[PDB]
Amino acid sequence: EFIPHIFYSLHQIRKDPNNLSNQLETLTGSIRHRLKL
């Protein structure tokens, strides 16, 4: 399953941009992983 994970990661992006760049980069990598699969 990639759909709910994409949804959720999307929402903690749009909820907390104030996270340090580390979390943003890691989470974007996670979304790139899910759409790659």
């Binding site: 974007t28 979304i31 790139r32 759409l35």
Partner: peptide, 27 residues
């Protein structure tokens, strides 16, 4: 060879395509 032509004919293929493009722009 006609398989990919049939696949490109249905809209949701284009949908996944520009969805990938939009995430590429976002990243």
């Amino acid at each position: 060879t006609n398989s990919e032509d049939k696949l490109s004919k249905v809209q949701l293929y284009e949908d996944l395509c520009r969805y990938e493009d939009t995430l590429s722009k976002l990243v």
